[PDB]
Each structure stands twice: as C-alpha cells, then as structure tokens.
Amino acid sequence: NRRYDSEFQTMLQHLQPTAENAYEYFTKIATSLFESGINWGRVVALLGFGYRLALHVYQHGLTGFLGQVTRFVVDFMLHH
Amino acid sequence: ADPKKVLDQAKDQMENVVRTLKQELEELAKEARKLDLTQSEKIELKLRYIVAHLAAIGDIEEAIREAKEEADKLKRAGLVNSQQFDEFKRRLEELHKEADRKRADYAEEFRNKL
C-alpha cells in the first residue's frame, strides 16, 4: 500500500515546512480536514501525511549534520 | 454481472471525488490570482490545497474499502467463485490506479499554477 508516497512527497516540497512550523501547519491541515468530515480513509491519509511530514522535517536536519561531520573529518585529513 | 455493478458504484464515486477535487482546486487557483497577494496568503493557499488533496486521497480510500466489503459479502454468500472474486479485486485495482493518476494530475497542474 504505497500508491500515495509520490503525492505525499510532492505536497511536502510544495509546502516547504520547517521544524518550527511543521506542527502548526499540520494542526491547521488536520482541523480543516476533520471539520469538513471524518472517515477511515481521511484518518489514514492524515496520519500518513503526519508521519511523512515528520520524516521530511527531520531528514532535512539529518543530512545537514552528516554533511558537517563528513566534511570535518576529511578536512582534518586534508590540512593535517 | 453483479460484481460489474459494484465496480460501477466505485467508478462513479471515485470520479465525483476527483471532480470535487477539480472544482475546489479551481476555486483555490482563482484566489491565487488575487492582486497584491501576501506571502502569508500564499501559504494559506498551500495549506488549503493539502487539505483538499488529502480529502481526495481518503475519500477514494473510503470508496475502495466499501467496494471490497460489498464483494466480501458476495463471496461469503457464494454468488462469486474464486476466479470471479479475484477478477473483481484485479479490476478494482485498475480503477484505483486510474483515480490516482487523475487525482495526481489535478494537484500537479495546480502546484504549477501557484
């Protein structure tokens, strides 16, 4: 059951969320969605969005730290 | 022929969902053509788009679930055999792949407009 990952990804790249505003953006999305109606598929889709929004925000920070760590180690092997 | 009727229920229901998504994305694109649109109002249009795209996903996932349960009733009664039942889920998956393509194409062209 993976049919929606390409769409979930394109949505997150359109939104361009950060670690600070991801939860605010998510709660606004969740509220407008459930105020217009709640059903099994919408709860699954929202939780699916929620989890991938968390991975989107935090993989952004992960690749950054990995870049800093790797660039540092090779820098020390370069000058020293 | 009875599973063919259940498939027609899912096809029409998924297409109304995709049309509901189409009509609201047109309404959001009209408001994105507003003069002197703030960066905040552009963000509020992005959030409203995600709400509509999620609703289109979950409501198609709702029509698929009901169609599978309507067929589970037919199988337990005995009106469909294993070959006819497995053909149902095969053609139900193609209608699902088709609704996904149309849903994604509407969201994709909207993102390009905004």
Residue numbers in the entry:
A (entry chain A): 86 to 165
B (entry chain B): 2 to 115
List passages from the publication reporting this PDB structure:
BCL-2 protein family members BAK and BAX are the gatekeepers of mitochondrial apoptosis. Homooligomers of BAK and BAX form pores in the mitochondrial outer membrane (MOM) and release apoptotic factors into the cytosol, committing the cell to destruction. We use computational protein design to generate high affinity binders of BAK and BAX with greater than 100-fold specificity for their target. Both binders activate their targets when at low concentration, driving pore formation, but inhibit membrane permeabilization when in excess.
We solved a structure of the BAK:αBAK2 complex in the P1 space group, diffracting to 2.9 Å, with four BAK:αBAK2 heterodimers in the asymmetric unit. The four heterodimeric complexes in the asymmetric unit are similar (between 0.15- and 0.29-Å Cα root mean square deviation (RMSD), 193 to 195 atoms aligned from a total of 197). BAK is in an unlatched conformation with α6 to α8 helices dissociated from the BAK monomer core. The unlatched α6 and α7 helices form a tetrameric BAK crystal contact in the structures, with their hydrophobic faces packing against α4 and α5 helices from a neighboring BAK monomer. No electron density is seen for the BAK α1 and α2 helices. The SDS–polyacrylamide gel electrophoresis (SDS-PAGE) of the crystals shows that the BAK construct is truncated, but only in the crystals and not in solution. The design model of BAK:αBAK2 is very close to the crystal structure, with an all-atom RMSD of 3.2 Å and Cα RMSD of 2.6 Å after alignment of BAK α3 to α5 helices (residues 90 to 141) and αBAK2. The position of BAK helix α3 relative to helices α4 and α5 is shifted by approximately one helical turn in the crystal structure compared to the design model, which was based on NMR structure 2M5B. Despite the α3 shift, the αBAK2 h1-h4 BH3-mimetic residues occupy similar positions at the BAK interface relative to BAK α4 and α5 helices. In conclusion, αBAK2 binds as designed in the BAK BH3-binding groove and can bind to BAK in a partially unfolded, unlatched conformation.
